[PDB]
Design a protein around this motif. Sequence first.
Motif, PDB file in Angstrom:
ATOM      1  N   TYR A 188       0.832  -1.442  -0.076  1.00 47.46           N
ATOM      2  CA  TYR A 188       0.271  -0.060  -0.019  1.00 47.46           C
ATOM      3  C   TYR A 188       0.986   1.121  -0.347  1.00 47.46           C
ATOM      4  CZ  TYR A 188      -4.156   3.413   1.439  1.00 47.46           C
ATOM      5  OH  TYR A 188      -5.229   3.907   0.969  1.00 47.46           O
ATOM      6  N   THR A 189       1.044   2.192  -1.335  1.00 50.14           N
ATOM      7  CA  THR A 189       1.255   3.559  -0.998  1.00 50.14           C
ATOM      8  C   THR A 189       0.380   4.533   0.036  1.00 50.14           C
ATOM      9  OG1 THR A 189       2.450   2.680  -2.773  1.00 50.14           O
ATOM     10  CG2 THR A 189       2.542   5.275  -2.655  1.00 50.14           C
ATOM     11  N   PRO A 190       1.059   4.848   0.755  1.00 45.82           N
ATOM     12  CA  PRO A 190       0.411   5.819   1.352  1.00 45.82           C
ATOM     13  C   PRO A 190       0.244   7.015   0.568  1.00 45.82           C
ATOM     14  CG  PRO A 190       2.574   5.060   2.373  1.00 45.82           C
ATOM     15  CD  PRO A 190       2.662   4.790   0.889  1.00 45.82           C
ATOM     16  N   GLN A 191      -0.677   7.855   1.515  1.00 45.48           N
ATOM     17  CA  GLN A 191      -0.841   9.303   0.418  1.00 45.48           C
ATOM     18  C   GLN A 191       0.288  10.578   0.411  1.00 45.48           C
ATOM     19  OE1 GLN A 191      -4.514  10.414   2.596  1.00 45.48           O
ATOM     20  NE2 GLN A 191      -3.555  10.454   4.481  1.00 45.48           N
ATOM     21  N   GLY A 192       0.907  10.357   1.681  1.00 46.15           N
ATOM     22  CA  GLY A 192       1.773  11.726   0.955  1.00 46.15           C
ATOM     23  C   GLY A 192       3.009  11.057   0.111  1.00 46.15           C
ATOM     24  N   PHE A 193       3.291   9.582  -0.060  1.00 47.23           N
ATOM     25  CA  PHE A 193       4.843   9.405  -0.530  1.00 47.23           C
ATOM     26  C   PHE A 193       4.148   8.411  -1.579  1.00 47.23           C
ATOM     27  CE2 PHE A 193       4.905   8.908   3.911  1.00 47.23           C
ATOM     28  CZ  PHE A 193       5.547  10.033   4.663  1.00 47.23           C
ATOM     29  N   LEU A 194       5.456   8.116  -2.401  1.00 48.36           N
ATOM     30  CA  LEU A 194       5.082   7.192  -3.396  1.00 48.36           C
ATOM     31  C   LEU A 194       6.466   6.000  -3.543  1.00 48.36           C
ATOM     32  CD1 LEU A 194       3.526   8.357  -7.112  1.00 48.36           C
ATOM     33  CD2 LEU A 194       6.674   7.494  -7.435  1.00 48.36           C
ATOM     34  N   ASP A 195       5.889   4.559  -4.129  1.00 52.34           N
ATOM     35  CA  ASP A 195       7.362   3.979  -3.898  1.00 52.34           C
ATOM     36  C   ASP A 195       7.519   3.763  -5.659  1.00 52.34           C
ATOM     37  OD1 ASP A 195       6.628   3.780  -1.316  1.00 52.34           O
ATOM     38  OD2 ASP A 195       5.360   1.684  -1.667  1.00 52.34           O
ATOM     39  N   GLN A 196       8.628   3.115  -6.187  1.00 51.46           N
ATOM     40  CA  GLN A 196       9.332   3.076  -6.872  1.00 51.46           C
ATOM     41  C   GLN A 196      10.177   2.190  -7.284  1.00 51.46           C
ATOM     42  OE1 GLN A 196      12.397   5.015 -10.452  1.00 51.46           O
ATOM     43  NE2 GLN A 196      11.281   6.351  -8.529  1.00 51.46           N
ATOM     44  N   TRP A 197       9.877   0.963  -8.279  1.00 54.43           N
ATOM     45  CA  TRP A 197      10.855  -0.086  -7.869  1.00 54.43           C
ATOM     46  C   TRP A 197      11.905  -0.180  -9.294  1.00 54.43           C
ATOM     47  CZ3 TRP A 197       8.628  -3.792  -5.364  1.00 54.43           C
ATOM     48  CH2 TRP A 197       7.542  -3.862  -3.878  1.00 54.43           C
ATOM     49  N   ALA A 198      12.643  -1.303  -8.423  1.00 58.46           N
ATOM     50  CA  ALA A 198      13.794  -0.995  -9.233  1.00 58.46           C
ATOM     51  C   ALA A 198      13.662  -1.639 -10.864  1.00 58.46           C
ATOM     52  CB  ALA A 198      14.702  -2.029  -8.865  1.00 58.46           C
ATOM     53  N   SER A 199      14.640  -0.864 -11.549  1.00 58.18           N
ATOM     54  CA  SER A 199      14.261  -1.320 -13.452  1.00 58.18           C
ATOM     55  C   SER A 199      16.254  -1.871 -13.771  1.00 58.18           C
ATOM     56  CB  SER A 199      14.550   0.219 -13.720  1.00 58.18           C
ATOM     57  OG  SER A 199      12.818  -0.326 -13.600  1.00 58.18           O
ATOM     58  N   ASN A 200      16.688  -2.502 -14.556  1.00 57.25           N
ATOM     59  CA  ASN A 200      17.802  -2.812 -14.858  1.00 57.25           C
ATOM     60  C   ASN A 200      18.432  -3.196 -13.359  1.00 57.25           C
ATOM     61  OD1 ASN A 200      19.547  -3.540 -17.000  1.00 57.25           O
ATOM     62  ND2 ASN A 200      20.523  -1.610 -16.911  1.00 57.25           N
ATOM     63  N   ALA A 201      18.052  -4.242 -12.601  1.00 58.75           N
ATOM     64  CA  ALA A 201      18.669  -4.310 -11.572  1.00 58.75           C
ATOM     65  C   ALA A 201      19.360  -5.930 -12.094  1.00 58.75           C
ATOM     66  CB  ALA A 201      17.796  -5.112 -10.377  1.00 58.75           C
ATOM     67  N   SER A 202      20.141  -5.888 -11.303  1.00 61.34           N
ATOM     68  CA  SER A 202      21.644  -6.742 -11.810  1.00 61.34           C
ATOM     69  C   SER A 202      21.930  -7.831 -10.193  1.00 61.34           C
ATOM     70  CB  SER A 202      23.457  -6.259 -11.710  1.00 61.34           C
ATOM     71  OG  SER A 202      24.184  -7.468 -11.948  1.00 61.34           O
ATOM     72  N   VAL A 203      22.146  -9.217 -10.860  1.00 59.40           N
ATOM     73  CA  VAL A 203      22.356 -10.123  -9.338  1.00 59.40           C
ATOM     74  C   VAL A 203      24.310 -10.771  -8.707  1.00 59.40           C
ATOM     75  CG1 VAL A 203      19.955 -10.771  -9.791  1.00 59.40           C
ATOM     76  CG2 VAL A 203      21.697 -11.964 -11.232  1.00 59.40           C
ATOM     77  N   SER A 204      24.216 -11.441  -8.614  1.00 61.84           N
ATOM     78  CA  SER A 204      26.459 -11.092  -8.484  1.00 61.84           C
ATOM     79  C   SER A 204      25.773 -13.528  -8.340  1.00 61.84           C
ATOM     80  CB  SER A 204      26.635 -11.174  -6.485  1.00 61.84           C
ATOM     81  OG  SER A 204      27.437 -12.301  -6.490  1.00 61.84           O
ATOM     82  N   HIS A 205      25.207 -13.766  -8.560  1.00 60.52           N
ATOM     83  CA  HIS A 205      25.081 -15.188  -8.460  1.00 60.52           C
ATOM     84  C   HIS A 205      24.661 -15.711  -9.805  1.00 60.52           C
ATOM     85  CE1 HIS A 205      27.356 -15.152  -4.801  1.00 60.52           C
ATOM     86  NE2 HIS A 205      28.318 -16.173  -5.015  1.00 60.52           N
ATOM     87  N   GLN A 206      24.166 -14.964 -10.309  1.00 57.68           N
ATOM     88  CA  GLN A 206      23.454 -15.320 -12.424  1.00 57.68           C
ATOM     89  C   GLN A 206      23.653 -16.781 -12.461  1.00 57.68           C
ATOM     90  OE1 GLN A 206      23.419 -12.082 -14.989  1.00 57.68           O
ATOM     91  NE2 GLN A 206      22.121 -12.202 -15.912  1.00 57.68           N
ATOM     92  N   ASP A 207      22.545 -17.079 -13.370  1.00 60.78           N
ATOM     93  CA  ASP A 207      22.533 -18.454 -13.822  1.00 60.78           C
ATOM     94  C   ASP A 207      21.865 -18.486 -14.519  1.00 60.78           C
ATOM     95  OD1 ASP A 207      23.964 -21.154 -14.048  1.00 60.78           O
ATOM     96  OD2 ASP A 207      23.261 -22.125 -12.343  1.00 60.78           O
TER      97      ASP A 207
END
Lengths: 162, 50
Positions: free
Chosen positions: A143-162
């Motif tokens: 739930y995003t609160p009325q006074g704020f805003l949530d932004q999600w990750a884009s072009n994320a990299s991991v360590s142990h990619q398989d």
Amino acid sequence: TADTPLCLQCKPLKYKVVRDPPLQMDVASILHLNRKFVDMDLNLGSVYQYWVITISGTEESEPSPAVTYIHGSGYCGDGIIQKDQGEQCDDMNKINGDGCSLFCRQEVSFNCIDEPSRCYFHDGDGVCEEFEQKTSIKDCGVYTPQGFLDQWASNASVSHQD
Amino acid sequence: NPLIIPVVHDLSQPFYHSQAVRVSFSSPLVAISGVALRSFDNFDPVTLSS
């Protein structure tokens, strides 16, 4: 068991139903052992208020609260939802175990989506609703609160990619 | 002598308009010449986050 030999000597209490338009003498004088009542002398337009007193012997108790019944209009078991009278749902169950109670109110965490008021459970369901956003955090996401805003990750990299 | 207290605040919590400062001490030899309050002359974060 179903027939104990100790409760046979107990006389059951009886009920007498009084209507706001008075019935005939052959109907109002009888006493019903059960709680079921039927009457035939009705008019299509006039309303009727019903209240039932509960006698034990000769003594008469206080009357029940009256119920207004219209022979043309509906009630809380007709299968037609009437939102002018405050009905959130209207089925024919008359059972509180379902999603819609006998007092024309839907239960907690239920929603009825049809004219005969078939209801479904929405907390474990996978479809998000309009009202479900602020209550069920486990289906519509965070739930995003009325006074704020949530932004999600884009072009994320991991360590142990398989 | 002008001791500075960094106000510790989380941005997830909404802001508040400070009005008064209470300073408490139990030793009698503490003498206070003056208290203050540092704010932003650029922006005010209360009038916008109504």
